[PDB]
Design an enzyme around this catalytic site. Structure first.
Site, PDB file in Angstrom:
ATOM      1  N   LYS A   1      -6.089  10.225 -10.749  1.00 52.07           N
ATOM      2  CA  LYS A   1      -6.362   9.067 -11.053  1.00 52.07           C
ATOM      3  C   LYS A   1      -6.967   7.840 -12.512  1.00 52.07           C
ATOM      4  O   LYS A   1      -7.527   9.323 -13.051  1.00 52.07           O
ATOM      5  CB  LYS A   1      -7.636   8.093  -9.862  1.00 52.07           C
ATOM      6  CG  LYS A   1      -8.088   6.910  -9.988  1.00 52.07           C
ATOM      7  CD  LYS A   1      -9.364   6.524  -9.071  1.00 52.07           C
ATOM      8  CE  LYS A   1      -9.184   5.330  -8.943  1.00 52.07           C
ATOM      9  NZ  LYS A   1     -11.113   4.634  -8.422  1.00 52.07           N
TER      10      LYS A   1
ATOM     11  N   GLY B   1      -4.252   2.207  -6.991  1.00 47.54           N
ATOM     12  CA  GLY B   1      -4.480   1.347  -7.769  1.00 47.54           C
ATOM     13  C   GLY B   1      -3.347   2.846  -9.028  1.00 47.54           C
ATOM     14  O   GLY B   1      -2.881   3.192  -8.189  1.00 47.54           O
TER      15      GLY B   1
ATOM     16  N   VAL C   1      -3.148   6.384  -9.113  1.00 45.65           N
ATOM     17  CA  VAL C   1      -3.040   7.717  -9.186  1.00 45.65           C
ATOM     18  C   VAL C   1      -2.001   8.364  -8.725  1.00 45.65           C
ATOM     19  O   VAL C   1      -1.014   7.430  -8.270  1.00 45.65           O
ATOM     20  CB  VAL C   1      -3.995   7.581  -7.951  1.00 45.65           C
ATOM     21  CG1 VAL C   1      -4.757   6.665  -6.719  1.00 45.65           C
ATOM     22  CG2 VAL C   1      -3.278   8.682  -6.810  1.00 45.65           C
TER      23      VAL C   1
ATOM     24  N   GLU D   1      -8.315  16.689  -5.029  1.00 43.97           N
ATOM     25  CA  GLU D   1      -7.899  17.629  -3.896  1.00 43.97           C
ATOM     26  C   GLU D   1      -6.916  16.860  -3.767  1.00 43.97           C
ATOM     27  O   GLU D   1      -6.504  15.424  -3.153  1.00 43.97           O
ATOM     28  CB  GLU D   1      -8.512  17.317  -2.578  1.00 43.97           C
ATOM     29  CG  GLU D   1      -9.856  18.339  -2.969  1.00 43.97           C
ATOM     30  CD  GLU D   1     -10.125  18.998  -1.825  1.00 43.97           C
ATOM     31  OE1 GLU D   1     -10.204  19.680  -1.320  1.00 43.97           O
ATOM     32  OE2 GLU D   1     -11.326  18.132  -1.533  1.00 43.97           O
TER      33      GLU D   1
ATOM     34  N   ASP E   1     -16.429   0.801   1.207  1.00 51.49           N
ATOM     35  CA  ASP E   1     -15.694   0.520   1.755  1.00 51.49           C
ATOM     36  C   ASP E   1     -14.856   1.331   2.807  1.00 51.49           C
ATOM     37  O   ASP E   1     -13.738   2.146   2.334  1.00 51.49           O
ATOM     38  CB  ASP E   1     -14.773   0.108   0.465  1.00 51.49           C
ATOM     39  CG  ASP E   1     -13.308   0.001   0.531  1.00 51.49           C
ATOM     40  OD1 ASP E   1     -13.373  -1.111   1.539  1.00 51.49           O
ATOM     41  OD2 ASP E   1     -12.673  -0.825  -0.599  1.00 51.49           O
TER      42      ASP E   1
ATOM     43  N   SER F   1       2.843   3.614  -4.956  1.00 46.49           N
ATOM     44  CA  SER F   1       3.493   2.540  -5.266  1.00 46.49           C
ATOM     45  C   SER F   1       2.657   1.593  -6.070  1.00 46.49           C
ATOM     46  O   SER F   1       2.634   0.969  -6.265  1.00 46.49           O
ATOM     47  CB  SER F   1       4.812   1.788  -5.156  1.00 46.49           C
ATOM     48  OG  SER F   1       5.767   2.381  -4.741  1.00 46.49           O
TER      49      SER F   1
ATOM     50  N   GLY G   1      -0.571   1.482  -4.612  1.00 43.33           N
ATOM     51  CA  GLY G   1      -1.471   1.717  -3.229  1.00 43.33           C
ATOM     52  C   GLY G   1      -2.888   1.814  -3.133  1.00 43.33           C
ATOM     53  O   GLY G   1      -4.170   1.404  -3.338  1.00 43.33           O
TER      54      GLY G   1
HETATM   55  C1  3T9 Z   1     -12.573  11.317  -3.358  1.00 39.09           C
HETATM   56  O1  3T9 Z   1     -13.204  10.086  -4.208  1.00 39.09           O
HETATM   57  C2  3T9 Z   1     -11.109   8.854  -4.574  1.00 39.09           C
HETATM   58  C3  3T9 Z   1     -10.044   9.845  -4.178  1.00 39.09           C
HETATM   59  C4  3T9 Z   1      -9.117   8.809  -4.546  1.00 39.09           C
HETATM   60  C5  3T9 Z   1      -7.616   9.586  -3.817  1.00 39.09           C
HETATM   61  C6  3T9 Z   1      -6.550   8.336  -3.505  1.00 39.09           C
HETATM   62  C7  3T9 Z   1      -5.756   9.527  -2.995  1.00 39.09           C
HETATM   63  C8  3T9 Z   1      -5.928  10.946  -3.012  1.00 39.09           C
HETATM   64  C9  3T9 Z   1      -4.622  10.660  -2.103  1.00 39.09           C
HETATM   65  C10 3T9 Z   1      -3.087  10.679  -2.237  1.00 39.09           C
HETATM   66  C11 3T9 Z   1      -2.008  12.045  -1.815  1.00 39.09           C
HETATM   67  C12 3T9 Z   1      -1.247  11.979  -0.750  1.00 39.09           C
HETATM   68  C13 3T9 Z   1      -0.846  10.701  -0.260  1.00 39.09           C
HETATM   69  C14 3T9 Z   1      -1.532   9.572  -1.191  1.00 39.09           C
HETATM   70  C15 3T9 Z   1      -3.117   9.781  -0.855  1.00 39.09           C
HETATM   71  N1  3T9 Z   1      -5.246  12.983  -2.509  1.00 39.09           N
HETATM   72  N2  3T9 Z   1      -6.167  12.883  -2.981  1.00 39.09           N
HETATM   73  C16 3T9 Z   1      -6.147  11.171  -3.333  1.00 39.09           C
HETATM   74  N3  3T9 Z   1      -7.741  10.692  -3.699  1.00 39.09           N
HETATM   75  C17 3T9 Z   1      -9.195   7.440  -5.519  1.00 39.09           C
HETATM   76  C18 3T9 Z   1     -10.366   7.416  -5.544  1.00 39.09           C
HETATM   77  C19 3T9 Z   1     -11.704   8.583  -5.554  1.00 39.09           C
HETATM   78  O2  3T9 Z   1     -12.876   7.843  -5.712  1.00 39.09           O
END
Ligand code: 3T9
Length: 274
Positions: free
Chosen positions: A35, A18, A20, A89, A135, A14, A16
């Site tokens: 994203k 941004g 995505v 991924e 971060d 929701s 969390g």
């Molecule tokens: C590797 O670089 C980045 C990765 C992400 C990002 C965030 C949440 C992600 C989930 C996910 C799947 C299920 C639940 C929660 C998260 N799977 N893959 C993700 N990737 C966002 C910005 C970036 O620069």
């Protein structure tokens, strides 16, 4: 087009991480994460080979996506009129480390050791590819529950790794080091060690050590949970007020607390399908 090769689903967390969303690569039903970032909200830009103007996040992602499963990989990206779209991924099943700790409380030292080792490996990899994450925190770490593998996410606050002074910072303040708070300048590696100190504390204690600038500046670490002497030393070491006094990555992985880590699959068998 994006609408063509991927089936988009609901938002993740929701907002969390941004904007995505969960998605599927329609050709093979590969779980992905999608994203979106709008150009107007981009502070830091990079240049891709062939000169294409692109958000720094993409340059960093291209550099760290080599097949090493310690960081979430960029599968593809698209440029739109007013925003950029990233395909990443998506581990399945997966849980964020922050949620994992919240539900479970302070982790047993065997498990924190496995996790922390994996995180170090992932950060070493990033540095080796010329990337400074900036971060590192529990919110930016995913757990691949089946394989027991941790993965770094969110390179949006990242920078190219350099050996000279940084004067900017857009990461999480309670994870930032005394030098930043006091002088608004830091060096990449010693600042990363500081944040790793915070992270490890969070793992073994169930929460972060400092909430305000003053607590960070003072650098006193009080342990609220039972923590081995060895692990306490490592944490106190990473959280040295003077950057120079902080350990190097090698010194951390050679620390006595770090010896005899579990393999990721062992970790999952013992702790993840407990
Ligand atoms: C590797 O670089 C980045 C990765 C992400 C990002 C965030 C949440 C992600 C989930 C996910 C799947 C299920 C639940 C929660 C998260 N799977 N893959 C993700 N990737 C966002 C910005 C970036 O620069």
């Amino acid at each position: 087009p994006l609408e063509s090769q991927y089936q988009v689903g609901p938002l993740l967390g929701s907002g969390g991480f941004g904007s995505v969303y969960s998605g599927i690569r329609v050709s093979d039903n590969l779980p992905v994460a999608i994203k979106h970032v709008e150009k107007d909200r981009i502070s830091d830009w990079g240049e891709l080979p062939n000169g294409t103007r692109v958000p720094m996040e993409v340059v960093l992602l291209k550099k760290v996506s080599s097949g090493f499963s310690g960081v979430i990989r960029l599968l593809d990206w698209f440029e739109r009129p007013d925003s950029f779209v990233l395909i990443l991924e998506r581990p399945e099943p997966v849980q964020d480390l922050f949620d994992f700790i919240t539900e479970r409380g302070a982790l047993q030292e065997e498990l924190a050791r496995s996790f922390f080792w994996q995180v170090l490996e992932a950060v070493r990899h990033c540095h080796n590819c010329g990337v400074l994450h900036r971060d590192i925190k529990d919110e930016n770490i995913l757990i691949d529950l089946n394989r027991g593998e941790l993965k770094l996410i969110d390179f949006g606050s990242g920078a190219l790794l350099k050996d000279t002074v940084y004067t900017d910072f857009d990461g999480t303040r309670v994870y930032s080091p005394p030098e930043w708070i006091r002088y608004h300048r830091y060096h990449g590696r010693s600042a990363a060690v500081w944040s790793l100190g915070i992270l490890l504390y969070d793992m073994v204690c169930g929460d972060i050590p400092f909430e305000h600038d003053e607590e960070i500046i003072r650098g006193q670490v009080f342990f609220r949970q039972r923590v081995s002497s060895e692990c306490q030393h490592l944490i106190r070491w990473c959280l040295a007020l003077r950057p120079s006094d902080r350990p190097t990555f090698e010194e951390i992985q050679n620390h006595p607390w770090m010896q005899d880590v579990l393999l990721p699959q062992e970790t999952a068998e013992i702790h993840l399908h407990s």
